[model samples]
Target: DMTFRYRGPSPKGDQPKAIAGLVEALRDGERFVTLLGATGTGKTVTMAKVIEALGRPALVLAPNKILAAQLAAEFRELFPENAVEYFISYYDYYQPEAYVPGKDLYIEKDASINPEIERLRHSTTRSLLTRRDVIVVASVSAIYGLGDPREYRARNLVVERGKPYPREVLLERLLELGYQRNDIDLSPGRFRAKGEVLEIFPAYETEPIRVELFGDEVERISQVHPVTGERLRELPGFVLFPATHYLSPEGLEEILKEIEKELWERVRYFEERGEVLYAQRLKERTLYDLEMLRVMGTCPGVENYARYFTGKAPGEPPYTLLDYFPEDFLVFLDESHVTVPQLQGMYRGDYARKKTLVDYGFRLPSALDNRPLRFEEFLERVSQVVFVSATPGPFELAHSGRVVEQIIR
Candidate 1:
């Protein structure tokens, strides 16, 4: 479905040879690809060329945030018609949940969510599901857990024109999707009602949406600037993705029961080990958590019980950004010298940090389930990788036999 509608400019310098070789090599169903270019050479532009030639959705992995930004900007210019989204951690700042056993220090997870980056993250997910021309610029953040792709698409609120959708039912669905109704403060993930008109600032959108209704029928849907009130588009339909990425299930009662059973097993294990303090601590926190789940539909550490909610078994791979891609999707590991090694290192450090909490009774054993994908897990998901590096590492060299040259500096 991708037209690769980029007639902008041809690759300059020695890019044509390097770009053509990489493109044909990758298209021939090669598992691994390597592009070697020095600092001053036009590797990035060659990359943009390869991507354009391939005509598939891509995931561009950067070593850090600054590099990610630069790539996103350039890719946006290259593929003006395609969706170029930035996916990063939503947290502006974060202090992980940690326990210092020597000094008896327990640090709770304190984090600030950045709304702008979050909107872009949601946009990344939305675009991938909706179209084939999506290029996501991401850091290591893509390795983290995300909502189930099946459920995320299933729960979409597909509003169409000339449909008999009741206003009340629409509002109820929004609530189910984790959108709050706040007329006083209209912000992202919040909706407001003024008589027959409903205004929603979608979590994934920069502009606010207005749906005018007559009785229970939708008259029109408009995307309007919040401050200027100027209409951007009058769409025939729209799909509203959930305000929150980690959406809970409708059968909360059942999930709570399963969680209770797990709690009993954990408590019995602690009690049999002659650790009544650990057992009691687990019970008190769990009871409060259950109450919060029943009342507010979520708790502070809601992700710890994600397996029970999402129906995934322990140690099973949770959903990630890579799941949002099609099977034939391509991955460009930018700066592979730094990016490749970073991918291999995520799981080890995460496990070490989490195992400490589990051993010291700070968190339940299942808490270890909420983690980044291991190196093997990541390998299983991705199809083809074009590792671009000035200094190639063992991973790239071992995987890729054909190396293209860009000696036109």
Candidate 2:
């Protein structure tokens, strides 16, 4: 199902030899490898060649957003036919919730999410699930928790022609998948209904789907232009994934009960320690959130309760973007010297901030569970890796099975 065809200019200089050596190392079952290439040595092209030869889904992790975008663009050019996706933090700016114990200041979390980037993030995950030829250029954000892929797949709604799917039932299913009903405005993550026809604009796609119903059976399905509403193509059937990556599992009342139980336990701990103020603060905040959850089904900062909703035990690792890949996938750590340290520090920095909040009762203890993957957790999820850097870090150098050097400067 995946074919990597290189459409860019042919490899030249030291690229060819470096590519050949890395490919051979991977083929020999070398799980950890390093490509040591200086600037202007065409490392991206070399990695592309190696990826093309191996014929497996690849993930390229950059140290930051700027580098991630640059790498994604180059890979898109080289593998025009394959799925080359950009996955990074969707926030234009984010100020995390924090507490300063010394000043007794609690700063609320604030963020500005770029809708375009959020769509691309959704597209990246959807592509990884549905295709084999995928190259995701990402930042450290990839290590953050995501909804369980199994739960995500299980919630998908597949519509086929002549199926006994009633219009109202289909509409209800769409709502459960996080799609909003807007009869006047048809946009991504929204659906419109008229008589026996239903139009849906999926989050990951530019074109909307039109489903026609005859009585209780699906009569036809087609992709339509968003503006002109002209049918573009007919389809036998299509599967609709959840509009949002963070999906709550079934039995909302059960999950809420579990969260409430944890809240009281934390409050009791504070009370036992004679921190009466802290206990009262914690109780009031958590009860308000629980009320919001009961009435609106969700409240601000719902990620704090991610463990309960995802059914992960305390301290268990949450699912990440890496979990979406097949077992044989390859990872290319770009600028490993910098990226290595970034990965190592993400969890510690996050923990220190969240711990302060939890201690002061600005957040429940479960908030600590919503965090980026620790370094060890990251290693456990990934398989074969090629650390690409001019100056490889000690961690990569020490662990690599083979080191291929390119000095064509």
Candidate 3:
């Protein structure tokens, strides 16, 4: 499922020796190799060549959002024929809930989603499942929770033409996959039903899937222009992945019961500690959340119980972007000196905030489980990787099997 095909030599006839050396080191079976180079040394360009030489999908982590944007743009320019995707938080503004016991303040959760950036976020996950030639430029926040990859893979609906697929049945499946039935205006993650024809705007695609059904039989299928309705090409079959990377409320009743049990246990612990006020607050919040979970299938700040929703046990790690990648995929920490430490530093403030919520009874103890992976957990989660930086950090420098000197500035 690899998507890369290097058509010719890298455009620059002869990059500095570091560029070629780093590429060779990675190709020659090095797990962690640091790139030592400065501005004008083509660190970014060298990684593009590394991807070209190895032909393995790479996940590049930048230090921040602005760096990620530039890195993603440059990769797209370098590999015009391949997938160079950006994976970043889609929220332009986000305000997490907080309870200030000392001041008696409670702030509600607030967020604003940017539609365009969200499309790219979905594109990143979709590409991981379907393509091999992918290079995802991501911010450090990329470690945030995502739906289990196995569940996502299991839910994909593959429609084979000339098969017995009722038009209505297929549409139902599309709805289950979170696609909206917008018959008038077709857009990504939307499908339109017109008589025996069903048009689908797949989440990861710019084009639409036109499925013509002969009653219960899948008669024909084609790719079509979303706006002009021009047929692009016919297809034997197509795979439809979920519209979002969150688990559907499958077997939700039992999950809620599990959450209730944890809530009760936490309440008992609070009572035993003689923090009766805390216990009462937790009870009110938990019951309200349970009611919402039962009726609406979700609640505000529901991600705190993501472990329960995903069927993971207490203390287990939640799924993340790294889980979405293929087994052999390569990871590149673009500025390892900064980004490696950034990955480790992300959890402290979050842990402190969530701990305050738990101790003060704003949230249950299980909420602590819903967080970014610790630095140790990160080491366990990643596979083959190349540590790229002008000055390698202590952890990477020591952990790298062999450090290839890419410092030809």
Candidate 4:
């Protein structure tokens, strides 16, 4: 499934040599390579060429969302046949939850998620799991915590013709995947059923899939137009990934109990320190959140308890987008001068704010575990790296095993 075709203009000037050098260096197992090209030297073309030559998945890290989108569009045009995905923060407007001790002010998290971008994020993960020729253009959000790739892949539901898949079992699986049962309106992340027929609009797709059942066996599977209900194409088997990235694993009751145990431990710690107010505050808030988790399966700041859900120990790193990549996948730090510093700074800033919340009894100590990857952790995950920059940063220059120059301006 690895097909990377460069459909755009041919590489000119120093682009071809730079691309060839990068590909050769990567082939020789160079851990880090820098493409030091000027602003107008067509660095993107060189990258596209290298990707086409390597035939492996790639991740391009941009400093901001707009640049990420621009790079994604360029890659899509270049690799018309491959999966070029855009992944960035899905929030249109975001004000993170914070506590100001000096002012005695607490700000609840407020944000509106851009549905289209959220869908693209889902599509990005799905493509990475299912294919090899995937290139994801993303911002610093790539280093942020995400659900475990293993759990996400394990939860996928596959339906094949003649398979003994009962309608009730299929519907239950969809619900467990975080899909909504919208019998009237068939939209993304929703499903509908009418006796023998089941229609699912998966979160990562534009079209809906129809499954026909005959006495507990899948009789047929096809892609259909959502509005027209017309069959577009038939599929031998369809894989439906979970509608949401964060999946509740089995034995959620035990997970919640563990949370309760932690809550009491933290309360006792505060009480022993003679901070009665802090102890009471922590106890009440955590109990309320636990109730919400038990009833609704999630709370407003559910991510704070990610340590429990992810089953990682204290100080262990949470899974991020980098975990979804194959071991041999290459990483390109676009405008490394800026993107390098951005990636390096994410963890420190996140830790400072979360540490304050924990100190003030607003959140538990485990909340500190839900954070962006440290700079070292980021480096540890990536195998090969290409730092693309007009002005290469100190970090990139110091780390690169080879520097391919394309300074023609």
Which sections of candidate 4 miss by over 4 Å? 91-93, 182-187, 194-196, 219-234, 248-250, 274-288, 296-300
| Best candidate according to lDDT | 4
Worst 10 residues of 2 by lDDT: 88-97
After superposition, which runs of candidate 1 have C-alpha atoms over 4 Å from their true positions?
7-9, 38-41, 91-93, 227-233, 247-250, 284-290, 299-301
Better of 2 and 3 by TM-score: 2
293-385 in candidate 4: lDDT tens per residue?
676555666778888877789999998889888877889999999999988999899999989889989889999998999999988998888
**Per-model TM-score on C-alpha atoms:** 0.91, 0.91, 0.83, 0.90
Q: How much lDDT does candidate 4 score?
A: 0.85
TM-score of candidate 3 on Cα atoms, chains taken together: 0.83
Give the Å shift of residue 217 in candidate 1: 1.7
Predicted candidate 2 versus true structure: per-residue lDDT over 211-329, tens digit per residue: 99999988999999999988999989998988766677667788888888988899889999999999898888888988877765566677778887777888998888888888888
Model 2 accuracy (lDDT, Cα): 0.84
TM-score of 4: 0.90
lDDT-best of 1 and 4: 4
Model 1, residue 188: C-alpha shift (Å): 2.0
Candidate 1: clashing pairs of residues: none
Which ten-residue region of model 3 has the weakest summed lDDT? 5-14
On the 0 to 100 scale, the lDDT of residue 181 in model 4 is: 79
Compose the digit string of candidate 3's lDDT tens values, residues 1-409: 2456544344353454666667676667776777765443266677776787777778899888888889988778777888889988732246567777689888767644455565787889888888888889999878877767787777889899989777777877886776777887888878888788888888778788999988798899999987788898999998888876656555768888888888889888989999999999999988898897676455556777788767777788888899988887888888889988888876786788788888888898888777888887887887666787767889888888766665444
